Design a protein around this ligand. Structure first.
Ligand code: NI
Ligand code: NI
Ligand code: NI
Ligand code: NI
Lengths: 100, 132, 564, 564, 100, 100
């Protein structure tokens, strides 16, 4: 499969978000790492799905709420950034104030 | 048998192990006169154990507990236990512990007298506070 | 002109009178002093002040004392300087100045030595806390990877021993004998932390001690496991005084050759470092804690009992019973009463240092975390320390910081080179985001270079994109890793040519000032009260006052921050 | 006093007459001899015997011959010493003694040289098996990472060649020429295994051979891929005898210049090492196996055919057909009859060594695993070897162990320094839990330091908490990794200053005793019978007896133990 | 997310236990690594869920049986140890004889 | 669990195939890495399940079609090879032309 360092690194994201999505579904309020994971993968998966940067951005800024996170985590996540592989290439996605 | 042994298991023979067989045994009576538990191991120089232990210290000169290597005896506060004692081997040279001997603990060559370095040791115990 | 605080802060961060929350704790620090004026504020960027001929000098060569690095507009939390806002400057891997940085051509009030120039790089400290890097005095050299866990919590110096995962190392902080020492000196060349090694103290004559001294150790470790005898103590300390090195102790838990009082007498008023002073980690049962009353004792605790929590007794019980492959040794070893007491004594300034006991009952990557966790649990239970100021927690915080910084250094005789943010010292520094204070640093600066950092996708268009995880940096690379790291040794060894003999490329620095020190030389943790322990109920009285607190359910800087 | 075996074992492990199950196999080893008396048993711990002035000497400096390390109460499984219970002692990265360790001041019967002291560290061998580290004679230097896979199965020495993933390396164990050799010597400095390099043997005059000899090789590899000609053989062997180095061969599979008999004649009764002697991995088809009858041949098999299983034919077929990017070459190359035969001949002591053929049809991390797997499949099919003792499998086990330990060493002329647990040898040792024997070691001891180990969470309060995975250790770190590792070379090279010229920091040791050896010098695998192969049906007869066994469905030490 | 070495290491556990739980649900009898994974994660997840060390211990000592494992695996797993992040911090959990 | 380098390496496969199987189930056409993942794990899991090399081979050569992959990926995957742990040991599995 000839995995490059960038490809391998992204496996960490996938593993932490799977754990995170399981936890959220048990009703656990998420922590910092977990929450960052879910927003990150949402973007990443959008990219793969063929969406625009603009569109994924919206999507990712809406996946998590204040209720879904542990008190204060918002303050820890002002923005999330990830590079994803869009149809037109690799692109930076910033997601502004994702926990509303 | 072989058919029953767990993974990495041992099949042990039957014959008991006999240790320290040759060595002459001195029984002493030990009372813990402190408020805190005292535990002593197999190779410690019994003579030099915690000041708070009261026993015939002279009798423990050059001695260790006649128990299994690596094991110990626990002396709880205000209890009395009899313990088996045996001499050390090799050269019977004991350095360190509480700095009571820092030498030779052997009998030497004269049956029905004590070596003077032993009597020195015993006197020194007494005035360093080692209860007899 | 006139500007609002809120607008000022946004540009430059907090100034004198402004208060900062240390994480999710209830600790609030306050800026005492602002050393970097107003209106001439040095910041790196496009269209900003540290540009050529403006804030930066553009005509001076480096030999005019121009800086190699500047950290700007930073909040300094240090046990000797306090809580200040300043520019910090580095030259030749050393702290040259704390004050106002810039260009004296165009600026008033530039601190001498803080000339920014052609030579200078920059770090933006505006929204950051700068600390001294921590120092871990109780390291078991079981695993080389510990170093990474340490750097990742803001620790950059290791004192201890071992030889990898041998049964002796698993239990003690000993590197026994001149062969093993040499080997270990050579190995640590591959590690991105400062190191000093400890030797085996349990010896009858001078010979076997001297051996190890010359071979390069900084200390002797006296451990039960190899014999914690009066003899051991006595000869170890006598040698120590000869060699200007330290002695650390793990006392007899079984009370075999003596009680605590007899141990005390074996010290013979000589300077000594006492590990896990409480006893859960080893020591004369129930009452090793009484050594914290003595002026010659430099006391430490290992980090698994701090803070005291609801799961603490369960954990420890079970841990020993496996640590020692084992019940009356157990419930005598593991005492709720003395554990609580340890917590209180910390808060009082009676136990002077935190330590890990790495992979021998404590957590190498949790010393900065646990310190903060303890301060905060204790504020809750006790309130303000009497010496606190009403609006802030500075006195407190600073007590705690001394515990992982300057106090360890002093104990091992390296405060001349490391442990505080002070002029003339090695730049062994940590940068933190307040939001993450104690837990998750930004970077580690190791000998004037960034050695370790939180870094995201190396392929990305920025340094911040995900996944962000701790990674070595250039100071951690090549020949620079050795250049920027110190191997501490005995003067004896230094003088005998250890550097040549052993073939070390590390900086090799002689330990000094270990034997003339006492408890009172310790910083913010200099208290010697009367300590009494009840041999029945294990209750602790400190100047006649029962020393207890209640366990915490919830720790700060804990499940919010960590996946671990 | 008197103690029960069961209680004794629990304290000290098994003694003479006690039997140990090697994993989930049906192999049972029995302790032949107990060298460490009764009643003065040396154990490390709190309240135990190796304390100051008691089991440990506390007055002797290291130059009195005090140990650097001691491994206590351990079961030694070695092809020359057998199955014994002893204390093992290490000094100056060498085995100083096997016997009773302690303090002669206070103890009777301390083996000379086994004085435990101030210098000494300790390993608790009570519930452990100690082996010599394995030696892999057939390494393709395709990937540096192989070393890690090897250490993780108890192999610490590599013999072979290559230059990374070139097509020549993918097929052969050759490092061709003075430039490439130099390069490769320099590279391996970065590896935590011992190494000796092989050169290209296919040459017409002395010139091209001599050149590589001086450059530092330990051997010449004769391969079909570069020409396995009579010429090659002849000149390679003549040079070898001159240089005191070894020759290894991969014969002509196509029968182009000859049949096996002609190859044999090309050997010209000269000492030679024969790789994959069966032929699945290369060689004169169908009948290369007949070389195992000759006294000058030191035979080896590669590990993918051992043990013979139900999936073995399917695998191999398909493998060649991709190895050679390809059917009458295939079904002639891959012969169920000779594969079974290989298995039997192993059990007989007719094939003397196991090897990997790393990433050129075999598995670098499976030599210790497969050896054990083979012994156990063979016990099942054949029963007890005639020389076995009725109650135990010692004879057998020990045959197999020789295969990965002493026999490889002897073949490459390094038995003077490595391959057995014997006094005066380099401490290249492996520690195993019986439960995991062959499969998953505890640790590797590499030049007297622990280089590799199964280690859990470096942040944890113990070394055992999860995840436990194999990790480098301090012997694998810094300048010690070179200090503790050997680069084997030719005497020619050594004498010419290879160490200086090439700038090597490794230990550089001359190979010796390669050319005077024969099959009969091999340990427990010294049999030279008549071997016949049927050119139609490929059936093998060994002294007139059909040599076959049936494939296994289920391997031991296999799916129970491994996620892989 | 500022993942520390301790955080990253724990991803291995999560990945192996997911595989292990899938296998057990197919009726496969588990091996050594797999079984150790399931016990480890049970503890870890308990910790996260807010339980006591005492309580997680029980839970983890009950997840796997003799039937659920391959013959002999018990002998290979006398105890399992893991550090988990409890409400009061990181704590060592020993789980005694988990395969009953 | 005493994980060896070979054991650890295989976790990458498990992580990428989980992602890949999720994507295929959304109707996404797979790429090169993803497709190689699914074939690889199919084999691996067969091995574990107790099948023969012969049998797993078939199984793996049938999991993915031309339709299930992105145009051209076939040309990128002529064969897939993996070592799996069969009842009789570690064995190489080649899977010939898996995308038919
Ligand atoms: Ni200790
Ligand atoms: Ni310790
Ligand atoms: Ni070959
Ligand atoms: Ni080969």
């Amino acid at each position: 499969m000839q995995l490059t360092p960038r490809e391998v690194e992204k496996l960490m994201i996938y593993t932490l978000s799977d754990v995170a999505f399981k936890r959220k579904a048990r009703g656990l309020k998420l922590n910092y790492p977990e929450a960052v994971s879910i927003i990150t993968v949402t973007a990443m998966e959008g990219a793969r799905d063929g969406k625009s940067v603009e569109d994924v951005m919206k999507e990712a800024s809406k996946v998590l709420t204040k209720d879904d996170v542990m008190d204060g985590v918002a303050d820890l996540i002002p923005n999330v950034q990830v590079e994803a592989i869009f149809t037109d290439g690799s692109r930076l996605v910033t997601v502004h104030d994702p926990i509303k | 048998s072989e058919q029953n042994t767990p993974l990495g298991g041992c099949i042990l023979a039957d014959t008991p192990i006999t240790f320290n067989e040759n060595k002459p045994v001195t029984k002493v009576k030990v009372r813990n006169t402190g408020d805190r538990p005292i535990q002593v191991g197999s190779h410690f120089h019994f003579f030099e154990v915690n000041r708070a232990l009261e026993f015939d210290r002279a009798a423990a000169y050059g001695k260790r507990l006649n128990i299994s290597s690596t094991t110990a005896i626990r002396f709880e506060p205000g209890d009395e236990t009899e313990v088996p004692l045996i001499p050390f081997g090799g050269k019977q040279t004991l350095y360190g512990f509480n700095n009571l001997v820092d030498g030779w603990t052997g009998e030497g060559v004269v049956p029905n007298s004590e070596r003077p370095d032993k009597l020195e040791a015993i006197r020194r115990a007494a005035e360093r506070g080692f209860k007899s | 002109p006139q500007i609002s605080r809120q607008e000022y802060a946004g540009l430059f961060g907090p100034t004198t009178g402004d208060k900062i929350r240390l994480g999710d704790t209830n600790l609030f620090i306050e800026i005492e002093k602002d050393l970097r004026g107003y209106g001439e504020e040095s910041v790196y960027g496009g269209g900003k002040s540290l540009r050529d001929g403006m804030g930066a000098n553009n005509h001076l060569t480096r030999d005019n004392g121009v800086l190699d690095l500047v950290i700007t507009n930073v909040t300094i939390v240090d046990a000797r300087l306090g809580v200040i806002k300043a520019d910090v400057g580095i030259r030749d891997g050393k702290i040259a100045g704390i004050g106002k940085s810039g260009n004296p051509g165009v600026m008033d009030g530039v601190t001498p030595g803080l000339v920014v120039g052609v030579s200078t790089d920059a770090i933006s400290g505006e929204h950051l806390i700068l600390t001294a890097a921590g120092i871990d005095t109780h390291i078991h050299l079981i695993s080389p990877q510990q170093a990474y866990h340490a750097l990742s919590n803001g620790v950059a110096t290791f004192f201890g021993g071992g030889i990898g995962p041998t049964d002796g190392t698993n239990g003690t902080t000993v590197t026994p004998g001149p062969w093993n020492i040499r080997q270990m000196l050579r190995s640590v060349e591959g590690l991105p932390v400062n190191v000093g090694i400890l030797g085996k103290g349990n010896s009858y004559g001078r010979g076997p001690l001297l051996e190890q001294a010359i071979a390069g150790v900084v200390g002797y470790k006296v451990h039960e496991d190899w014999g914690a005898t009066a003899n051991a103590l006595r000869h170890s300390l006598r040698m120590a005084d000869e060699m200007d090195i330290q002695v650390s102790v793990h006392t007899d838990s079984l009370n075999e050759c003596g009680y605590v009082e007899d141990t005390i007498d074996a010290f013979e008023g000589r300077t000594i470092h006492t590990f896990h002073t409480e006893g859960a980690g080893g020591g004369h049962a129930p009452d090793i804690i009484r050594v914290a009353s003595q002026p010659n004792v430099l006391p430490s605790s290992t980090n698994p009992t701090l803070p005291y929590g609801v799961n603490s007794q369960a954990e420890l019980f079970d841990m020993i019973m496996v640590c020692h492959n084992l019940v009356s040794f157990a419930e005598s070893r593991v005492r709720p009463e003395t554990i609580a007491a340890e917590n209180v004594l910390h808060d009082m300034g009676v136990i002077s240092m935190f330590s890990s006991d790495s992979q021998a009952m404590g957590r190498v990557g949790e010393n900065w975390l646990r310190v903060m966790q303890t301060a905060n649990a204790m504020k809750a239970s006790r309130g303000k320390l009497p010496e606190d100021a009403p609006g802030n927690d500075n006195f407190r915080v600073l007590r705690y910081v001394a515990k992982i910084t300057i106090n360890p250094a002093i104990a091992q005789g390296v405060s001349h080179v490391i442990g505080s943010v002070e002029v003339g010292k090695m730049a062994d520094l940590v940068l933190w985001d307040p939001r993450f204070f104690g837990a998750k640093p930004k970077m580690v600066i190791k000998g004037g270079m960034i050695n370790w950092a939180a870094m995201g996708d190396p392929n990305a268009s920025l340094p911040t994109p995900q996944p962000v995880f701790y990674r070595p940096m250039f100071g951690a690379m090549g020949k620079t890793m050795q250049d920027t790291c110190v191997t501490f040794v005995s003067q004896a060894a230094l003088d005998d040519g250890v550097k040549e003999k052993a073939g070390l490329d590390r900086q090799v620095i002689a330990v000094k000032n270990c034997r003339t020190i006492s408890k009172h030389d310790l910083v913010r943790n200099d208290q010697t009260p009367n300590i009494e322990v009840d041999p029945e109920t294990f209750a602790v009285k400190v100047d006649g006052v029962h020393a207890t607190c209640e366990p915490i359910d919830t720790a700060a800087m804990n499940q919010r921050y960590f996946f671990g």
